[PDB]
Design a protein around this ligand. Structure first.
Ligand code: NA
Length: 330
């Protein structure tokens, strides 16, 4: 089997991407944020505290003929941005792009933090990191990918995120038309439950490539690229008037600037992030200070190849017995 679903930016900045997901029978279609940095499939629901719902589409298990309470199971998650959600668990039929899993754990939110309530476009998350990070207690549950794996033509999914445009998540196959050149594969550590890999270095603009090992995670659920302070300082030093602002919470730059590209290494290959991808626009409406898309990972405890990096590439998440990541230009 295979699946193929279009993923759409939620706003003009590509802050996140939503992908339609069919849950239950008859289908209830919710727009989920596919997150390779977490392992819970959770939804806004008929159980969510009413004051915490503001425009999201909800899953109502009582209207699904295939929903079953997973008796006793609860979940609670906290993300890197300080957001959180918790609730109880149903099993139900879940389909993505024509690929169906029966018996998927669908985590029904009873509570969500303010950042979820305030984002009317995101109806929940679909985690695609390793199932060892799933929060369901007392019986940990599998991700949609892990449940689909054995049925897939190849045990893979791919992320092809657009810059200010829709893109695609495919399950079970490589679309050889979706990238240019060849795919470079690199080793993954699953020790922390993430798609954790080691970049071979970076360049700023037309500068020379610096060979240096950068361990980090491929995380579709993180907007920005978070890298060590040395690397980030080297990037922003090439933009006149850029500075790190403790008041704003990261590097800012004059909105009049033209940003340089950023290159990261994947083995001997190179992925180039155009400068335009690094512009996250005014820090507040009408400001001439713009927020940078490359930020320091110091204090976060891990480097994160978020959407700024990933949308410059066709990315293969290879879930074979020895997992690997692949990156191609596109
Ligand atoms: Na922000």
């Amino acid at each position: 089997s295979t699946g193929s679903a279009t993923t759409t930016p939620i706003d003009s900045l590509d802050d996140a991407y939503i992908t339609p997901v069919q849950i239950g029978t008859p289908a209830q279609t919710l727009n989920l944020d596919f997150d390779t940095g977490s392992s819970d499939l959770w939804v806004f629901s008929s159980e969510t505290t009413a004051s915490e719902v503001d425009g999201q589409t909800i899953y109502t298990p009582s209207k699904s003929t295939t929903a079953k309470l997973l008796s006793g199971a609860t979940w609670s998650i906290s993300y890197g941005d300080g957001s959180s959600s918790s609730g109880d668990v149903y099993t139900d039929t879940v389909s993505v792009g024509g690929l169906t899993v029966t018996g998927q754990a669908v985590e029904s939110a009873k509570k969500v933090s303010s950042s979820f309530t305030e984002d009317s476009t995101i109806d929940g998350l679909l985690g695609l990191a390793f199932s060892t990070l799933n929060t369901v207690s007392p019986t940990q549950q599998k991700t949609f990918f892990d449940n689909a794996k054995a049925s897939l033509d190849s045990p893979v999914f791919t992320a092809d995120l657009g810059y200010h445009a829709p893109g695609t998540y495919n399950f079970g196959f490589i679309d050889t038309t979706a990238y240019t050149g060849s795919i470079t594969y690199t080793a993954v550590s699953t020790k922390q439950g993430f798609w954790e890999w080691t970049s071979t270095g970076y360049a700023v603009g037309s500068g020379t490539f610096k060979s240096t090992s950068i361990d980090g995670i491929a995380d579709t659920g993180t907007t920005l690229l978070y890298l060590p302070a040395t690397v980030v300082s080297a990037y922003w030093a090439q933009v006149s008037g850029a500075k790190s602002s403790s008041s704003v919470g990261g590097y800012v730059f004059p909105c009049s600037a033209t940003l340089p590209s950023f290159t990261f290494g994947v083995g001997s290959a190179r992925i180039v992030i155009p400068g335009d991808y690094i512009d996250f626009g005014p820090i507040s409406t009408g400001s001439s200070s713009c927020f940078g898309g490359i930020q320091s990972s110091a204090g976060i405890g891990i480097n994160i190849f978020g959407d700024v990096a990933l949308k410059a590439a066709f990315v293969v998440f290879n879930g074979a017995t020895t997992p690997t990541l692949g990156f191609a230009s596109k």
